[PDB]
Design brief:
Chain A: GO terms for molecular function: RNA binding; rRNA binding; structural constituent of ribosome. Chain A: InterPro entries: Ribosomal_uL5, Ribosomal_uL5_C, Ribosomal_uL5_CS, Ribosomal_uL5_dom_sf, Ribosomal_uL5_N. Chain A: One of its GO terms (cellular component) is nucleus. Chain A: This is Large ribosomal subunit protein uL5A. Chain A: It is found in: Cytoplasm; Nucleus. The structure is cut from a larger assembly and holds chains A (169 residues), B (58 residues), C (215 residues), D (296 residues) and E (159 residues). Chain A has 169 residues and is α+β, with helices and mostly antiparallel strands. Helix content of chain A is 22%, strand content 21%. Chain A is built from 3 helices and 7 strands; from the N terminus they run E-H-E-E-H-E-E-E-H-E. In chain A, the strands form 2 sheets. A 5-stranded antiparallel sheet of chain A has the order 2-3-1-6-5, covered by helices on one side. A two-stranded parallel ribbon of chain A has the order 4-7. Chain A is globular. With 58 residues, chain B is an all-alpha fold. The longest helix of chain B is centred in the C-terminal third of the chain and has 20 residues, at 36-55. Chain D is globular, with a radius of gyration of 26 Å. In chain D, helix 4 packs parallel to helix 5 (157-167) and helix 4 (94-111) runs parallel beside helix 10 (235-248). Chain D contains 12 helices and 4 strands, in the order H-H-H-E-E-E-H-E-H-H-H-H-H-H-H-H. With 296 residues, chain D is of the alpha+beta class. The longest helix of chain D is centred in the middle third of the chain and has 18 residues, at 94-111. Chain D has a 4-stranded mixed sheet with strand order 3-2-1-4, covered by helices on one side. Chain E has helices at residues 27-30, 102-121; strands at residues 38-41, 60-66, 70-79, 82-91, 95-97. Chain E has 2 helices and 5 strands, in the order H-E-E-E-E-E-H. At the D-E interface, helix 3 of D face helix 1 of E. Bound molecules: potassium ion and magnesium ion (18 copies). Chain D binds 6 RNA strands through helix 1, helix 2, helix 3, strand 1 and strand 2.
Chain lengths: 169, 58, 215, 296, 159
RNA sequence: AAGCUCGUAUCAGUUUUAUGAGGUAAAGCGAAUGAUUAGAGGUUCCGGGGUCGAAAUGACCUUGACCUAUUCUCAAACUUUAAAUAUGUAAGAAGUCCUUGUUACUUAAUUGAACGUGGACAUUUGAAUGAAGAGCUUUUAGUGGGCCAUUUUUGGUAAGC
RNA sequence: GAGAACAGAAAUCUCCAGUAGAACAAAAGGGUAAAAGCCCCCUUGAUUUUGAUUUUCAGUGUGAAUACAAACCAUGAAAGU
RNA sequence: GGUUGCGGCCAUAUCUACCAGAAAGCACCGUUUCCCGUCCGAUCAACUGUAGUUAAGCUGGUAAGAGCCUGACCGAGUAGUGUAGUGGGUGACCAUACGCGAAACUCAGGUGCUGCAAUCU
RNA sequence: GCGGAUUUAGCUCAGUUGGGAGAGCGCCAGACUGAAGAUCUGGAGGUCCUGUGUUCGAUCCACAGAAUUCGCACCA
RNA sequence: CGCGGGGUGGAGCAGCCCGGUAGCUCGUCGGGCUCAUAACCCGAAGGUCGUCGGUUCAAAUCCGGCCCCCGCAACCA
RNA sequence: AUGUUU
């Protein structure tokens, strides 16, 4: 009994946080460009602390945001890697959820040593219709409490759809 | 040898011996800092007013 | 050595606390301000006695520590460690300065006199007004003489005049004893720690129902 | 509730609320100050804004001056008045914005007695030009464009309304680099593309493409056009006739206002909750307290 | 060394009236100042341009010039044993219309009306203000107001 | 000192009325910042340790480190608030009101701005008190080591510092 | 604060809360939230002429600053700046 | 009286938690050829007003609500302070006389008002 | 008391630009020797003089001290 | 300000004095000889010539600015 | 050419 409080995928962000900025970074950018079908964005480092050799504004990561049916397809493809089993702790309090895969080459294109191996980070942001209220320029507002996404709502939606399951508390 | 540095002692008495005089307001005050565009137009307006008043004294 | 307290008895300077602009203040001699049975409930100690200043002056942290030690030791010896709760209600936040002038023959030769005389931190003192409470001690009504004598002993450690006053309040609360009794029998007082919380007729009814089940 | 919701008493006490229309996300006061602030050496001259606002399903085009008591509308035009001039569909598109700007310009000139002089651009061809002052005559009515919070983009319907108001005879200072048809790679505008957008050429071309393509989309979109038997090639003459009728009679015939304001007020007053009095609040508090005869 | 800058000792003078920070409301810019208008000077700390010197905070003067965003104000400054004419170029955010003469203008209109009605009805004007006069005789009744006798209270501590 | 122009008179180390400005005294810290005392309840997912736990924080003992509601005491270089004294301006004819002339300024526009012509209003011409009058000018002496008293106040233990 | 492979207590990605508790070259104070902060785009008003004004003040100088005028520009859709 | 565009004062307007909303309006909402902008039509742009919904925004109500606002022979004429004495007191400081006069606290009330224009069961 | 300096593994020291705690002599272990010394390899060794704050972190950017010392301390 | 000279492997120098092109010694490492060490013998590694720009069928070199070091000489706001 | 002790 809910007209348009239908939880749906707003976006899926694929992330490759490489420890360096060498050719591996370009290869990772090409990797997450291939399945996304969009030009990715380079993420510069903000500090130079320790243990990574990363420097201020070194372009150490690369990410891409996918929306709509392409995002849903990529989400299902990365879910088949995790065998449709995600931990409960994988679900955030605000109703989004994520997971990490390694050895991405097990789907789509093969090893291709010109490209190499990268694990990738999936994060899915979940909301309802009317999320524009918080993002539009004019009359920007806050989504009401009953319309906000919760971790329980996202867990229930994620087990209803994909016929998946969650794990221990 | 050190000496005194500053004091306002007796200064008000000195000022009030000849008094604090208000600055003698005049009608038609000076147009020193008035906007020069306004002043330029005011000159022509006053010239036209003077000529009109002279011509109209028949 | 330490200068005599007569040199810093009076509030001659503006308050000069340890701050961003001092950074070099020695530690106060008194570090403990609550002693005795400081965990006792408000119901346990109805009788409150105050050692109150009758002068505008400065009490050194050394004198505060000496008087606290004297009063606590006397009342502990006579009535027991847990027969009272003594609270020092003045904190030595004002820093005293000293312009150190080396004492020896020929000091004028290697001294600048009054040039650059601004002093270094010498100690700490509490600035008390007339009628300001210095010591508060709550206890049972039977321990009145012991408590009064303890504060009388502590008074010898302070400069100036101090008065022993029996408070009309219940313990360390701001309520006169009949009013506290009425509130307690009406159930609008809940023990929180060594102090109590009072039920107000304002705020959320759900919270005023949860706390203070006086309904 | 949450450890970050239900902010603390100190935070609430020290919170300074923005201006109400800034909290509502409606007024950009930084821009409004510069739009409204008059040269002090005029001492009464209002600065008229051509306020153009786009809601869903409607376009608001107002001419507004500022006072201490509040803003005062000199003339207002809406895109829901375009059916009177022969536009019944696409009431928020570029051509509707142009028509509304032309209507507000003509209505304001008629109100100010400046309609015969400053006829504007009667033969619109998409050429960039401002309403010039006539020689030895009153200067054209000058208004300044007020987008509001809408973003300045090359092709915006807000600049379509600007173009329509400028063509209507109002002097609205503007450049041509925000009109549809401006080539960002160079410094010239495309007058044919601007005229096409003025007369709905982009919408007609979309209609033709959708008809020559999958008909389900052309049946869902433009459904009212089919039900009104309006062809894509008819849009240019529809908007030309609308411009002619606007120039012919921009006199703001208002709605007949059935259900007079008093019965409107009564009907709305039926469906409104009233504030409980202090006696009722105390009664509810006493009832809630007496509910705990024991403890629930 | 000593420090006397342009904005020296203005730390609290030029503050923003706690919980009234941010943008200046539009009535300040919609105010109209004519030459001869009397204005009070109060610097707005958020507008750093056209700002008056700290000496003129709280000073009341007369507009002598009107520019695009500012007015010229005439202030008589006490220098030594006399007053010197100072001309300040102040943006409108730092001034407001003075109400030191609104009461005078309303009294002027009321006096004109009273004089006209006097010369229409009879002969009585009394158009000058008068200081608060001594109270006239009055009779104070005890009906329901019988005097209650008070006494000084004895000393007690209640601490 | 010399005076000069006037003297229906002008103004004032003062009050009153009206209207501003200030951030000191006080006050406040269950209000921001910085200090500061104590207990209480939640945080074992509190940082955890002891001890088991075959081991996990899992069961406890519990040192904390936070959060919540309280609590004692403070600030020249803290503050929501905020005096008293002191302080700016105004209390009219150089005013008010009505009509309309100039402009190359300004307005969409005789629109506004400023300066005007003409007309009307003297018992209190628009608070109090006072006024060996007011205003103005020139030219010159000496002085340019200060000190004391009440009150506010800085350094200093203090000083006839 | 809650979430994601390596990746932990600091890397990158996401959401929520967040009156400024950040940042604005430097000392401190004031000021600033669709900004004065961060990023991006275009630029040279850090230009010309000579006056007026505020502070310091003798109402001198110097420094600094304010508001105009007469030009030429920059920017923006524009008001403006 | 509701709603919208522009607003004035800028919390009596804010914040938290629930509830309700007829009509219209607003809104969410549907699409990507065109102008335009993005990693992503999410934002921004354009198109449709059609496919749907009041779920959210928004509005209003509720709450011994937080905050905020107002008032008080509430605290308190208290603190402080101008003026006075060959007043008290070793002093610290204090009292008195003629005046001005808080803040905290407590209690009570309140929770946007309003301008222009348009529109509405 | 003033004006300065330095403080780093047991010893001498290098850091230092918002690098990163390191090198010799010591010690240990293994080589070599019949066995020593000498050499030759490898390793450990500091919570950078103490405490508090500002930085994304910190000897190093960065406050109050503590220790060790050098120069001056004069005219009667 | 002026005139000059110098900067080259970790260190000290040549090659520069007109482009045919980076070398000598010490130092480091590996091996060889010796019972072992030094000398000795054979290898390897080490600058691309103080920083940029300029002219050259292909410049450390020739030219012009600039950084550091030294000598001499000069000095009205 | 040199190679220290027992
Ligand atoms: K004593
Ligand atoms: Mg002397
Ligand atoms: Mg002297
Ligand atoms: Mg002192
Ligand atoms: Mg001597
Ligand atoms: Mg803007
Ligand atoms: Mg202030
Ligand atoms: Mg500036
Ligand atoms: Mg001050
Ligand atoms: Mg104080
Ligand atoms: Mg002399
Ligand atoms: Mg901006
Ligand atoms: Mg200077
Ligand atoms: Mg969309
Ligand atoms: Mg849009
Ligand atoms: Mg609803
Ligand atoms: Mg409340
Ligand atoms: Mg006397
Ligand atoms: Mg032997």
């Amino acid at each position: 009994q809910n007209p348009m409080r239908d939880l749906k995928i707003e976006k899926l962000v694929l992330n490759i946080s490489v420890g360096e900025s060498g050719d591996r970074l370009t290869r990772a950018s090409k990797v997450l460009e291939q399945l996304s079908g969009q030009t990715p964005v380079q993420s510069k480092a903000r500090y130079t602390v320790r243990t990574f050799g990363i420097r201020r504004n070194e372009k150490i990561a690369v990410h891409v945001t996918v929306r709509g049916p392409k995002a849903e397809e990529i989400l299902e493809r990365g879910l088949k890697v995790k065998e449709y089993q995600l931990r409960d702790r994988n679900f955030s309090a605000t109703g989004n959820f994520g997971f990490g895969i390694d050895e991405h080459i097990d789907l789509g294109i093969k090893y291709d040593p010109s490209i190499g191996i990268f694990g990738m980070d999936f994060y899915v942001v979940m909301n309802r219709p009317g999320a524009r209220v918080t993002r539009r320029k004019r009359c920007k507002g806050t989504v009401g409490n009953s319309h906000k996404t919760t971790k329980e709502d996202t867990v229930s939606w994620f087990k209803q759809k994909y016929d998946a399951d969650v794990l221990d508390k | 040898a050190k000496s005194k540095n500053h004091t306002a002692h007796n200064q008000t008495r000195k000022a009030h011996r000849n008094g604090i005089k208000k600055p003698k307001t005049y009608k038609y005050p000076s147009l020193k800092g008035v906007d020069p565009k306004f002043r330029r137009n005011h000159k022509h307006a006053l010239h036209g007013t003077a000529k009109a008043l002279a011509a109209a004294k028949k | 050595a330490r200068r005599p307290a007569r040199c810093y008895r009076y509030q001659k300077n503006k308050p000069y606390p340890k701050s961003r602009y001092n950074r070099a203040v020695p530690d106060s001699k008194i570090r403990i301000y609550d002693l005795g049975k400081k965990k006792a409930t408000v119901d346990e100690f109805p009788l409150c006695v105050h050692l109150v200043s009758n002068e505008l002056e400065q009490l050194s942290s050394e004198a505060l520590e000496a008087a606290r030690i004297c009063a606590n030791k006397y009342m502990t010896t006579v009535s027991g460690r847990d027969a009272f709760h003594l609270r020092v209600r003045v904190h030595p936040f004002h820093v005293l300065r000293i312009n150190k002038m080396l004492s020896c023959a020929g000091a004028d030769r290697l001294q600048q006199g009054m040039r650059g005389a601004w002093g270094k931190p010498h100690g700490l003192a509490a600035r008390v007004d007339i009628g300001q409470i210095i010591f508060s001690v709550r206890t049972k009504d039977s321990n009145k003489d012991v408590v009064v004598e303890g504060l009388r002993r502590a008074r010898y450690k302070f400069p100036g005049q101090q008065k022993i006053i029996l408070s009309k309040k219940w313990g360390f609360t701001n309520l006169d004893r009949p009013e506290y009794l009425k509130k307690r029998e009406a159930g609008e007082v809940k023990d929180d720690g060594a102090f109590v919380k009072f039920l107000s007729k304002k705020g959320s009814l759900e919270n005023n129902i949860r706390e203070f089940p006086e309904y | 509730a949450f450890q970050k919701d239900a902010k603390s008493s100190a935070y609430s006490s020290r919170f300074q609320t923005p201006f109400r229309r800034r909290r509502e996300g409606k007024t950009d006061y930084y821009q409004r100050k510069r739009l409204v602030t008059q040269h002090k050496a005029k001492y009464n001259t209002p600065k008229y804004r051509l306020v153009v606002r786009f809601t869903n399903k409607d376009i608001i085009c107002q001419i507004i001056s500022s006072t201490i008591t509040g803003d005062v509308v000199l003339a207002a035009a809406y895109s829901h008045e375009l059916p009177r001039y022969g536009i019944t569909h696409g009431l928020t598109n570029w051509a509707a914005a142009y028509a509304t700007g032309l209507l507000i310009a003509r209505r304001t000139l008629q109100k100010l007695g400046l309609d015969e002089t400053y006829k504007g651009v009667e033969e619109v061809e998409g050429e960039y030009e401002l309403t010039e002052a006539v020689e030895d005559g009153p200067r054209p009515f000058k208004v300044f464009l007020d987008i509001g919070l809408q973003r300045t983009t090359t092709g915006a319907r807000v600049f379509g309304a600007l173009k329509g108001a400028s063509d209507g005879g109002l002097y609205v200072p503007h450049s041509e680099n925000r009109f549809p048809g401006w080539d960002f790679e160079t410094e010239e505008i495309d007058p044919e593309l601007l005229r096409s957008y003025i007369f709905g050429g982009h919408v007609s071309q979309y209609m033709e493409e959708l008809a020559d393509d999958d008909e389900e989309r052309f049946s869902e979109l433009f459904k009212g056009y089919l039900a009104d038997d309006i062809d894509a090639d008819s849009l240019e003459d529809i908007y030309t006739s609308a411009h002619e009728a606007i120039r012919a009679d921009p006199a703001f015939k208002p709605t007949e206002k059935k259900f007079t304001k008093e019965q409107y007020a009564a009907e709305s007053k039926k469906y409104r909750q009233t504030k409980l009095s202090k006696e009722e609040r105390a009664a509810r508090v006493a009832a809630k307290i007496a509910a705990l005869a024991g403890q629930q | 060394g000593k420090s006397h800058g342009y904005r020296s000792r203005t730390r609290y003078m030029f503050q923003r009236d706690f919980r009234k920070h941010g943008a200046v409301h539009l009535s300040t810019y919609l105010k109209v100042y004519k030459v001869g208008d009397i204005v009070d000077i109060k610097a707005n700390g958020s507008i750093q341009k056209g700002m008056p010197h700290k000496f003129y905070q709280g000073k009341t003067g007369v507009v002598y010039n009107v520019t695009k965003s500012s007015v010229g104000v005439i202030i008589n400054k006490m220098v030594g044993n006399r007053y010197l004419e100072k001309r300040l170029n102040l943006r409108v955010e730092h001034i407001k219309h003075s109400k030191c003469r609104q009461e005078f203008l309303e009294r002027v209109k009321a006096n004109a009306a009273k004089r006209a009605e006097a010369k229409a009805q009879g002969v009585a004007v009394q158009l000058k203000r008068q200081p608060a006069q001594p109270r006239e005789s009055r009779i104070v009744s005890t009906e329901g107001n019988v005097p209650q006798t008070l006494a000084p209270v004895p000393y007690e501590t209640f601490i």
